[PDB]
Amino acid sequence: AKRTKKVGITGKYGVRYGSSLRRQVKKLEIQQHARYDCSFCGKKTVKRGAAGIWTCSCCKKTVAGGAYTVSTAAAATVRSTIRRLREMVEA
Amino acid sequence: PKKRASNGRNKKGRGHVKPVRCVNCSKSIPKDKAIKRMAIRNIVEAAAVRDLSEASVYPEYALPKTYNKLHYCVSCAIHARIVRVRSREDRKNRAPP
Amino acid sequence: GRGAPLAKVVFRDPYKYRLREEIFIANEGVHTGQFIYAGKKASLNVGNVLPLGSVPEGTIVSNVEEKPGDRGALARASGNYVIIIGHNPDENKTRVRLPSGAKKVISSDARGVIGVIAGGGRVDKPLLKAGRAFHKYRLKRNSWPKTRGVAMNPVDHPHGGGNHQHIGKASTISRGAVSGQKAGLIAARRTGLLRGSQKTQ
Amino acid sequence: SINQKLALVIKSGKYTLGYKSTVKSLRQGKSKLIIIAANTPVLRKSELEYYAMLSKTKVYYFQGGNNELGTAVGKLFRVGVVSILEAGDSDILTTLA
Amino acid sequence: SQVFGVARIYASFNDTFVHVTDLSGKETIARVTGGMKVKADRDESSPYAAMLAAQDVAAKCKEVGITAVHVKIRATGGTRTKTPGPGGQAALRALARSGLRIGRIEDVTPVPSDSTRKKGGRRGRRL
Amino acid sequence: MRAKWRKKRTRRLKRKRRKVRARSK
Amino acid sequence: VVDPFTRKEWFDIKAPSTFENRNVGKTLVNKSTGLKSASDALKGRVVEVCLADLQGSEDHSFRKIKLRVDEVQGKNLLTNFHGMDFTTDKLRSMVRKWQTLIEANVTVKTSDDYVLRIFAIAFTRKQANQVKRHSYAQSSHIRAIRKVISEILTKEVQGSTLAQLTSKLIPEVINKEIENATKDIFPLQNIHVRKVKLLKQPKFDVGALMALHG
RNA sequence: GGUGAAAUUCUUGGAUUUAUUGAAGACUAACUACUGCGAAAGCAUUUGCCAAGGACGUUUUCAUUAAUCAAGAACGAAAGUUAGGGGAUCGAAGAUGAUCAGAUACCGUCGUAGUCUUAACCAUAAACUAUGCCGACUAGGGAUCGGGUGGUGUUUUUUUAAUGACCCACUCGGCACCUUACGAGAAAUCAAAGUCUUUGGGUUCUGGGGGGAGUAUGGUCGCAAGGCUGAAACUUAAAGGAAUU
Ligand SMILES: [Zn+2]
Ligand SMILES: [Zn+2]
């Protein structure tokens, strides 16, 4: 059954630290502890260690990433921007 | 036993059109309403043209014109513009003059 | 003591048969088994080490040399980058925006690795407890916990003393003050809540 | 288009899925076409291409990963390479070569 | 063929400007305003003020040596009126009558492509 | 009075009353 | 009590060879002393002058041209092309209600390293037996026409240099070319190049400059 | 400068004005219309990518799958809230100059939040064609948007071909409009507000004199602001709608 109505993972902190702080932490800690899809093997086995490091269980590939998610919006913009610049030079 | 009060009638609106600003008061008015005119005027008044043609090189010279579209709100148009006020019947008319 | 991850990159020595290993700061997106190209004639891809003259304008780089040979000074912490915002090909200079907002002018021969440094989003999370701040700083240095001058005695701090906890004098203190007298907001050109557009130019 | 083609081959013709069975059929010469996902490792891709240039066999590079190729050939699992060894009612060999 | 300048009239409401330049613009000659002549603080936009100003400007132009002048007439433009004020006609008549020759005339009021919210608010300038 | 401003009046009154009741509760 | 017209030095401006006539104008700069010699004060100047004035034909009563000063030969400097623009009066006369307006832009490089944005405009017209007022285009014709104009401007640049380009812009050959290419899409009156503006210059090429003399 | 006129303000340390450049962010003028798309809110620079949708056409297929719908869901202007970024302009608050009997208002100069964006909340509006959706019938007229048909039709071509754009006739589907009342209506007005005491095509929602009161209370949603739901006591003979002089 569903055990908490809204706190979720941040029920480990109980009554402490304040609701807004626990909410911010919740939002980030979900991403933190999630499983993501490998760009290389196509499987959903990417977990983090050691903020910024995302390992695939299978395939053993390790990607540099964000601290609580694999890809940040900034780096997405960067790879698209750099692609556009490279193509502006050679295409 | 709920009880309420007045309530009111209606004009064919659109949807949404973006607003413009009145050229005198700066009031935001939607373009559909927005009384609109086109000021096309010679740069020079009708009398200075003789003096300026006498004083100008380049015969026929050009006499260009300055053009600008004026948007008036209703209040400012009624205070100035030729919009003035009409009877029930004449205010169905829609022709310019 | 570093939120940004590192990349152990292995290169070959041109002059002796061996492998020379180098420690880069990982740009976001780089991965194990990836080839890293370093030099003047390297392609514009994430993780590559190019000169900031060779890159075009709008390019996003990191670990970028102040002057050629220092091996990386700027845009090195988590999530940070500099933007290139113009070249001056005469006198081989290049104007760039740093993460503070400052514009700087660097040599075009100064290298920079393409992309943003990983570990971003780190300071979004509430650290949320003193123990986590403790474990943060016991791997950096003894800068934590911090007691207030107002909370200590006058021998121990300028703000110390009083029958109430107060400073008594303007906490804004000159750049020409000397050691022992510099314990507030040093050379503060303004103070207070920041309102409106800063970075005025 | 290629998806509908493959969907016809998968019900009418003779196919095998997976790297080992492709390589086996390709050593045997039974294979006509191989479709290769995009996210497959480049070494595996190269080995397949080389086996194919030895067997004189055609190669299509699927613009899609192994999950997408699984869905395209009608399977709830992911597949990185497909071998078409007898096309049935389809047209896929001549549609592209 | 004669020697030319450009008059660059700015007939806002609330004041007028007549200041002649070289063909390039960097070289400025004989700047005067309607508020330099009259001392009323509200007749600065009057045609009389503009006429007196243009008379002075044409005198200075003749002293320096300037025979003809192109005209670039202007209003405030931008988000403001973009309709020329009263002093423009007056100044034109003035420095046409006052010996100078008039080349080509142009209206150079800065017009936007609907930029930068106007002043007055949403309900406008009231009274 | 204008109904807009009567509504605003009752709203300010309503939140004053919420606060005054929280004092006890 | 100085009267700087004691010192301000009367000076000439001569246009390049490729319009019709070169004697454009006279400026005043200053007296070229040490501490701000005049040849560094007057080398960035631009001069907006009518193509009617520097071509003799009043048909170019519009089409102002900006010439940018580049060199000096003894009170007799030769200048070069910096831009072309229409006049506000002509734009606002063109722009009439009850028709569709078409604008096109393209950034293009010449056969030399000049880069420039060139801005064309066109207006629908009413086809000579037409009863309805308004003469609007679909909004697919419009993008067809924009594509055509862009192609034409790109292929009419990176032909020859600014010299031949100005030689093309003056007698308005591109306009007739657009008309011919858009016969089969939509009628299209008042075809023009509203602007041509420079945004990047080559490295000063004094041979190509000084090959514009008498 | 700014104004009705002023002052506040800036200014020979050289303002305003001119020219040449640059940066920043916002906005898409004129064209722009009784024109278009969209469930509405709403949507106007170019180009490309992504997927969607209507109408038309169709001697294509399915075959009654449909209409409206408590509950229950998605979207939902502006303001507002949270956090980052951005922060030019305008500008709740505030400060100031003036006007004024007063003027902590209108006018003027500054200007914080906001105005922009990203990720989330809120969920209201004269959110208005205060006209619910579906379906059928009933009067004339012309014009317009989109699609289609036909015409020895005009023009551009290559005199003369196709197309493209126009013209004529017709047609389906839309935004609407002009005229009239066979009708309807309290009238204002209405081609729907008609086909209703000659009262019944199908279906959902809401109202029962005015105030109190959309208040109190209780629940529920919400970070909050608040939203949804929602009385009673008590009071009162009028309140109100269209038109008339
Ligand atoms: Zn993997
Ligand atoms: Zn107004």
Coordinates of N, CA, C and O (backbone and C1' of nucleotides) in Angstrom, one line a residue, chain H residues 92-160:
Chain H
rA92 P 3.5 53.0 -10.7 O5' 2.8 52.1 -9.6 C5' 3.3 50.8 -9.2 C4' 2.2 50.0 -8.6 C3' 1.8 50.4 -7.2 O3' 1.0 51.6 -7.1 C1' 1.8 48.0 -7.4
rA93 P 1.2 52.6 -5.9 O5' 2.1 51.8 -4.9 C5' 1.5 51.2 -3.7 C4' 2.6 50.6 -2.9 C3' 3.4 51.6 -2.1 O3' 2.7 52.1 -1.0 C1' 4.8 50.0 -3.0
rG94 P 2.7 53.6 -0.7 O5' 4.2 54.1 -0.6 C5' 5.0 53.5 0.4 C4' 6.5 53.7 0.1 C3' 6.9 55.2 0.0 O3' 7.0 55.8 1.2 C1' 7.8 54.0 -1.8
rA95 P 6.6 57.4 1.4 O5' 7.7 58.1 0.6 C5' 9.1 57.9 0.9 C4' 10.0 58.5 0.0 C3' 9.9 59.9 -0.3 O3' 10.4 60.7 0.8 C1' 10.3 58.8 -2.3
rU96 P 10.0 62.3 0.9 O5' 10.7 62.9 -0.4 C5' 10.4 64.1 -0.9 C4' 10.6 64.3 -2.3 C3' 9.8 65.4 -3.0 O3' 10.3 66.7 -2.6 C1' 9.8 63.5 -4.3
rG97 P 9.3 67.9 -2.1 O5' 8.9 68.6 -3.5 C5' 10.0 69.0 -4.4 C4' 9.4 69.4 -5.7 C3' 8.2 70.2 -5.7 O3' 8.3 71.5 -5.4 C1' 8.0 68.5 -7.3
rA98 P 7.3 72.3 -4.5 O5' 5.9 72.2 -5.3 C5' 5.7 73.1 -6.4 C4' 4.7 72.6 -7.4 C3' 3.3 73.0 -7.1 O3' 3.0 74.3 -7.3 C1' 3.4 70.8 -8.0
rU99 P 1.9 75.1 -6.3 O5' 0.5 74.6 -6.8 C5' 0.2 74.7 -8.2 C4' -1.0 73.8 -8.5 C3' -2.2 74.0 -7.7 O3' -3.0 75.2 -8.0 C1' -1.8 71.7 -8.0
rC100 P -3.5 76.1 -6.8 O5' -4.4 75.2 -5.9 C5' -5.6 74.6 -6.5 C4' -6.2 73.6 -5.5 C3' -6.4 74.1 -4.1 O3' -7.6 74.9 -4.0 C1' -5.4 72.0 -4.0
rA101 P -7.7 76.2 -3.1 O5' -7.6 75.6 -1.6 C5' -7.3 76.4 -0.5 C4' -7.5 75.7 0.8 C3' -6.8 74.4 1.0 O3' -5.5 74.6 1.5 C1' -9.1 74.2 1.7
rG102 P -4.3 74.0 0.7 O5' -4.3 72.4 1.0 C5' -4.1 72.1 2.4 C4' -4.7 70.7 2.7 C3' -4.3 69.6 1.9 O3' -3.1 69.0 2.3 C1' -6.6 69.6 2.0
rA103 P -1.8 68.9 1.3 O5' -2.2 67.9 0.2 C5' -2.6 66.5 0.6 C4' -2.9 65.7 -0.6 C3' -2.2 66.0 -1.9 O3' -1.8 64.9 -2.6 C1' -4.4 65.9 -2.2
rU104 P -0.3 64.5 -2.8 O5' 0.1 63.5 -1.6 C5' -0.8 62.4 -1.3 C4' 0.0 61.4 -0.6 C3' -0.7 60.0 -0.5 O3' -0.6 59.2 -1.6 C1' 0.1 60.7 1.6
rA105 P -1.9 58.4 -2.2 O5' -2.7 59.5 -3.0 C5' -2.2 60.0 -4.2 C4' -3.3 59.9 -5.2 C3' -3.0 60.5 -6.6 O3' -2.2 59.6 -7.4 C1' -5.1 61.3 -5.9
rC106 P -1.2 60.2 -8.5 O5' -2.2 60.8 -9.6 C5' -3.2 60.0 -10.3 C4' -4.2 60.8 -11.1 C3' -3.6 61.6 -12.2 O3' -3.4 60.9 -13.4 C1' -5.3 62.8 -10.9
rC107 P -1.9 60.6 -13.8 O5' -1.2 62.0 -14.1 C5' -1.8 62.9 -15.1 C4' -1.0 64.2 -15.2 C3' 0.5 64.0 -15.1 O3' 1.1 63.6 -16.3 C1' -0.1 65.7 -13.7
rG108 P 2.3 62.5 -16.3 O5' 3.5 63.3 -15.7 C5' 4.0 64.5 -16.4 C4' 5.1 65.2 -15.6 C3' 6.3 64.3 -15.3 O3' 7.2 64.2 -16.3 C1' 5.6 65.5 -13.4
rU109 P 7.8 62.7 -16.6 O5' 9.0 62.6 -15.6 C5' 10.1 63.5 -15.7 C4' 10.9 63.5 -14.4 C3' 11.6 62.2 -14.1 O3' 12.8 62.0 -14.9 C1' 10.6 63.1 -12.2
rC110 P 13.3 60.5 -15.1 O5' 14.0 60.2 -13.7 C5' 13.9 58.9 -13.1 C4' 14.3 58.9 -11.7 C3' 14.3 57.5 -11.1 O3' 15.6 56.9 -11.3 C1' 13.0 58.8 -9.7
rG111 P 15.7 55.5 -12.1 O5' 15.0 54.4 -11.1 C5' 15.5 54.3 -9.8 C4' 14.4 53.8 -8.9 C3' 13.8 52.4 -9.3 O3' 14.6 51.3 -8.9 C1' 12.1 53.9 -8.7
rU112 P 14.6 49.9 -9.7 O5' 14.0 48.9 -8.6 C5' 14.7 48.8 -7.3 C4' 13.9 48.1 -6.3 C3' 13.1 46.9 -6.7 O3' 13.9 45.7 -6.7 C1' 11.7 48.3 -5.5
rA113 P 13.8 44.6 -7.9 O5' 12.4 43.9 -7.7 C5' 12.2 43.1 -6.5 C4' 10.8 42.9 -6.2 C3' 9.9 42.2 -7.2 O3' 10.1 40.8 -7.2 C1' 8.8 44.1 -6.5
rG114 P 10.5 40.0 -8.5 O5' 9.3 40.4 -9.5 C5' 8.0 39.8 -9.4 C4' 7.0 40.6 -10.1 C3' 7.0 40.5 -11.7 O3' 6.4 39.3 -12.2 C1' 6.8 42.7 -11.0
rU115 P 7.0 38.6 -13.4 O5' 6.8 39.6 -14.6 C5' 5.6 40.0 -15.0 C4' 5.6 41.1 -16.0 C3' 6.4 40.8 -17.3 O3' 5.6 40.1 -18.2 C1' 7.0 42.9 -16.4
rC116 P 5.8 38.6 -18.5 O5' 7.3 38.5 -19.0 C5' 7.7 39.0 -20.3 C4' 9.0 38.4 -20.7 C3' 9.2 36.9 -20.5 O3' 8.6 36.1 -21.5 C1' 11.1 38.1 -19.7
rU117 P 7.9 34.7 -21.1 O5' 9.1 33.8 -20.7 C5' 10.1 33.5 -21.7 C4' 11.4 32.9 -21.1 C3' 11.3 31.6 -20.4 O3' 11.3 30.5 -21.3 C1' 12.6 33.1 -19.1
rU118 P 10.3 29.3 -21.0 O5' 11.1 28.5 -19.9 C5' 12.4 27.9 -20.2 C4' 13.1 27.3 -19.0 C3' 12.2 26.4 -18.2 O3' 12.0 25.1 -18.7 C1' 13.4 27.8 -16.7
rA119 P 10.6 24.3 -18.6 O5' 10.6 23.9 -17.1 C5' 11.6 23.0 -16.6 C4' 11.6 22.9 -15.1 C3' 10.3 22.5 -14.5 O3' 10.0 21.2 -14.5 C1' 11.3 24.3 -13.3
rA120 P 8.5 20.7 -14.5 O5' 7.7 21.8 -13.7 C5' 6.6 21.6 -12.9 C4' 6.7 22.0 -11.5 C3' 5.5 22.2 -10.7 O3' 5.0 21.0 -10.2 C1' 7.0 24.0 -10.3
rC121 P 3.4 20.8 -9.9 O5' 3.0 21.9 -8.9 C5' 1.9 22.8 -9.1 C4' 1.8 23.8 -8.0 C3' 0.4 24.4 -7.9 O3' -0.5 23.7 -7.2 C1' 2.1 26.1 -7.8
rC122 P -2.1 23.6 -7.6 O5' -2.5 25.1 -7.6 C5' -2.5 25.8 -6.3 C4' -2.7 27.3 -6.5 C3' -4.1 27.7 -7.1 O3' -5.1 27.8 -6.1 C1' -2.3 28.9 -8.2
rA123 P -6.5 27.2 -6.3 O5' -6.9 27.8 -7.8 C5' -7.9 28.8 -7.9 C4' -8.3 28.8 -9.3 C3' -8.9 27.5 -9.8 O3' -10.3 27.3 -9.4 C1' -7.3 28.3 -11.4
rU124 P -11.6 28.0 -10.0 O5' -11.3 29.5 -9.6 C5' -12.2 30.5 -10.1 C4' -11.5 31.9 -10.1 C3' -12.1 32.9 -11.0 O3' -13.3 33.5 -10.5 C1' -9.7 32.9 -11.1
rA125 P -14.6 33.7 -11.4 O5' -14.1 34.7 -12.6 C5' -13.6 35.9 -12.2 C4' -13.3 36.9 -13.3 C3' -14.1 36.8 -14.6 O3' -15.4 37.3 -14.5 C1' -11.8 37.2 -15.1
rA126 P -16.7 36.6 -15.2 O5' -17.1 37.6 -16.4 C5' -17.4 38.9 -16.2 C4' -17.3 39.7 -17.5 C3' -15.9 40.1 -17.9 O3' -15.6 39.9 -19.3 C1' -17.3 41.9 -18.0
rA127 P -14.2 39.4 -19.8 O5' -14.0 38.0 -19.0 C5' -14.8 36.9 -19.3 C4' -13.9 35.7 -19.7 C3' -14.7 34.4 -20.1 O3' -15.3 34.5 -21.3 C1' -12.8 33.9 -18.8
rC128 P -16.8 33.9 -21.5 O5' -17.6 35.0 -22.2 C5' -17.9 34.9 -23.6 C4' -18.2 36.3 -24.2 C3' -17.1 37.2 -24.3 O3' -17.2 38.0 -25.5 C1' -18.8 38.2 -23.1
rU129 P -16.8 37.3 -26.9 O5' -18.2 37.0 -27.6 C5' -19.0 38.1 -28.1 C4' -20.4 37.7 -28.3 C3' -21.0 36.8 -27.2 O3' -21.4 37.6 -26.1 C1' -21.5 35.9 -29.3
rA130 P -22.2 37.0 -24.9 O5' -22.2 38.1 -23.8 C5' -23.2 38.3 -22.8 C4' -23.1 37.2 -21.8 C3' -24.3 36.4 -21.5 O3' -24.0 35.1 -21.1 C1' -23.6 37.4 -19.5
rU131 P -23.2 34.0 -22.1 O5' -24.0 34.2 -23.4 C5' -24.3 33.0 -24.3 C4' -25.7 32.7 -24.3 C3' -26.0 31.8 -25.5 O3' -27.2 31.0 -25.2 C1' -27.1 33.8 -25.8
rG132 P -27.1 29.5 -24.5 O5' -25.8 28.9 -25.1 C5' -24.6 28.9 -24.4 C4' -24.2 27.5 -24.1 C3' -24.2 26.5 -25.2 O3' -23.2 26.7 -26.2 C1' -25.1 25.5 -23.3
rC133 P -23.5 26.5 -27.8 O5' -23.5 24.9 -28.0 C5' -22.3 24.2 -27.7 C4' -22.5 22.7 -27.6 C3' -23.2 22.0 -28.8 O3' -22.3 21.9 -29.9 C1' -24.2 21.2 -26.9
rC134 P -22.8 22.1 -31.4 O5' -23.8 20.9 -31.6 C5' -23.3 19.5 -31.4 C4' -24.3 18.5 -31.5 C3' -25.2 18.5 -32.7 O3' -24.6 18.1 -33.9 C1' -26.5 18.1 -30.8
rG135 P -24.9 19.0 -35.3 O5' -26.3 18.6 -35.7 C5' -26.7 17.2 -35.8 C4' -28.1 17.0 -35.9 C3' -28.9 17.9 -36.8 O3' -28.7 17.6 -38.2 C1' -30.1 17.7 -34.9
rA136 P -28.8 18.8 -39.3 O5' -30.3 18.9 -39.5 C5' -31.1 17.8 -39.8 C4' -32.6 18.1 -39.9 C3' -33.0 19.3 -40.7 O3' -33.0 19.2 -42.1 C1' -34.1 19.3 -38.6
rC137 P -32.8 20.4 -43.0 O5' -34.1 21.3 -42.8 C5' -35.4 20.8 -43.2 C4' -36.5 21.6 -42.8 C3' -36.6 23.0 -43.3 O3' -37.1 23.1 -44.7 C1' -37.0 23.1 -41.0
rU138 P -36.7 24.3 -45.6 O5' -37.3 25.6 -44.8 C5' -38.7 25.7 -44.8 C4' -39.1 27.0 -44.0 C3' -38.6 28.3 -44.5 O3' -39.4 28.8 -45.6 C1' -38.2 28.1 -42.2
rA139 P -38.7 29.2 -47.0 O5' -37.5 30.2 -46.7 C5' -37.7 31.3 -45.8 C4' -37.7 32.6 -46.5 C3' -36.6 32.8 -47.5 O3' -36.8 32.1 -48.7 C1' -37.0 34.8 -46.2
rG140 P -35.7 32.2 -49.9 O5' -35.8 33.7 -50.4 C5' -34.8 34.3 -51.1 C4' -34.9 35.8 -51.2 C3' -33.7 36.5 -51.7 O3' -33.5 36.5 -53.1 C1' -34.4 37.5 -49.7
rG141 P -32.2 35.8 -53.7 O5' -31.1 37.0 -53.4 C5' -31.4 38.3 -53.7 C4' -30.3 39.3 -53.2 C3' -28.9 38.8 -53.4 O3' -28.4 38.9 -54.7 C1' -29.1 39.8 -51.3
rG142 P -27.3 37.9 -55.3 O5' -25.9 38.6 -54.9 C5' -25.7 39.9 -55.3 C4' -24.7 40.6 -54.3 C3' -23.3 40.0 -54.2 O3' -22.5 40.3 -55.2 C1' -24.2 40.4 -52.1
rA143 P -21.2 39.3 -55.6 O5' -20.2 39.5 -54.4 C5' -19.7 40.8 -54.1 C4' -19.0 40.9 -52.7 C3' -17.9 39.9 -52.5 O3' -16.7 40.3 -53.1 C1' -19.3 40.1 -50.6
rU144 P -15.6 39.2 -53.4 O5' -15.2 38.6 -52.0 C5' -14.3 39.4 -51.1 C4' -14.1 38.8 -49.8 C3' -13.4 37.4 -49.7 O3' -12.0 37.5 -49.8 C1' -15.3 37.3 -48.4
rC145 P -11.1 36.4 -50.5 O5' -11.0 35.3 -49.4 C5' -10.2 35.6 -48.2 C4' -10.1 34.4 -47.2 C3' -9.9 33.1 -47.8 O3' -8.5 32.9 -48.1 C1' -11.6 32.9 -46.4
rG146 P -8.1 32.1 -49.5 O5' -8.4 30.6 -49.2 C5' -7.7 30.0 -48.1 C4' -8.3 28.6 -47.9 C3' -8.5 27.7 -49.1 O3' -7.3 27.2 -49.6 C1' -10.4 27.6 -47.7
rG147 P -7.2 26.9 -51.2 O5' -8.1 25.6 -51.4 C5' -7.9 24.4 -50.7 C4' -8.9 23.4 -51.0 C3' -9.3 23.1 -52.4 O3' -8.4 22.3 -53.1 C1' -11.3 23.3 -51.1
rG148 P -8.3 22.4 -54.7 O5' -9.7 21.9 -55.3 C5' -10.0 20.6 -55.1 C4' -11.4 20.3 -55.6 C3' -11.7 20.6 -57.0 O3' -11.2 19.6 -58.0 C1' -13.5 21.4 -55.7
rU149 P -10.8 20.1 -59.4 O5' -12.2 20.3 -60.1 C5' -13.2 19.2 -60.2 C4' -14.5 19.6 -60.7 C3' -14.5 20.3 -62.1 O3' -14.2 19.4 -63.2 C1' -16.0 21.4 -60.7
rG150 P -13.3 19.8 -64.4 O5' -14.3 20.8 -65.2 C5' -15.6 20.4 -65.6 C4' -16.4 21.6 -66.1 C3' -15.8 22.5 -67.1 O3' -15.7 21.9 -68.4 C1' -16.9 23.8 -65.4
rG151 P -14.6 22.4 -69.4 O5' -15.0 23.9 -69.7 C5' -16.3 24.2 -70.3 C4' -16.6 25.7 -70.3 C3' -15.8 26.6 -71.2 O3' -16.4 26.6 -72.5 C1' -16.0 27.6 -69.0
rU152 P -16.1 27.7 -73.6 O5' -14.5 27.8 -73.6 C5' -13.8 26.6 -74.1 C4' -13.0 27.0 -75.4 C3' -12.4 28.4 -75.5 O3' -11.2 28.5 -74.8 C1' -13.5 27.9 -77.5
rG153 P -10.8 29.9 -74.1 O5' -12.1 30.5 -73.4 C5' -13.0 31.5 -74.0 C4' -13.0 32.7 -73.2 C3' -11.7 33.4 -73.0 O3' -11.3 34.2 -74.1 C1' -12.9 33.3 -70.9
rU154 P -9.7 34.6 -74.2 O5' -9.4 35.6 -73.0 C5' -9.9 36.9 -73.0 C4' -9.2 37.8 -72.0 C3' -7.7 37.7 -72.2 O3' -7.1 38.5 -73.2 C1' -8.3 37.5 -69.9
rU155 P -5.7 38.2 -73.8 O5' -4.7 38.3 -72.6 C5' -4.4 39.6 -72.0 C4' -3.5 39.5 -70.8 C3' -2.1 38.9 -71.0 O3' -1.2 39.8 -71.5 C1' -3.2 38.0 -69.1
rU156 P 0.0 39.2 -72.4 O5' 0.9 38.5 -71.4 C5' 1.5 39.2 -70.3 C4' 2.3 38.3 -69.3 C3' 3.3 37.3 -70.0 O3' 4.5 37.9 -70.2 C1' 1.9 36.2 -68.4
rU157 P 4.9 38.4 -71.7 O5' 4.4 37.2 -72.7 C5' 5.3 36.3 -73.1 C4' 5.7 35.3 -72.0 C3' 6.5 34.0 -72.5 O3' 7.9 34.3 -72.6 C1' 4.7 33.4 -71.0
rU158 P 8.6 34.7 -74.0 O5' 9.0 33.3 -74.6 C5' 9.4 33.3 -76.0 C4' 8.6 32.4 -76.8 C3' 7.1 32.6 -76.7 O3' 6.4 32.4 -78.0 C1' 7.5 30.4 -76.1
rU159 P 6.4 33.6 -79.1 O5' 5.5 34.7 -78.5 C5' 4.2 34.3 -78.0 C4' 3.1 35.2 -78.5 C3' 1.7 34.7 -78.4 O3' 1.1 35.0 -77.1 C1' 2.0 35.5 -80.6
rU160 P 1.0 33.9 -76.0 O5' 0.1 32.7 -76.6 C5' -1.2 33.1 -77.2 C4' -1.5 32.1 -78.3 C3' -1.7 30.7 -77.9 O3' -2.9 30.4 -77.4 C1' -0.3 30.8 -79.9

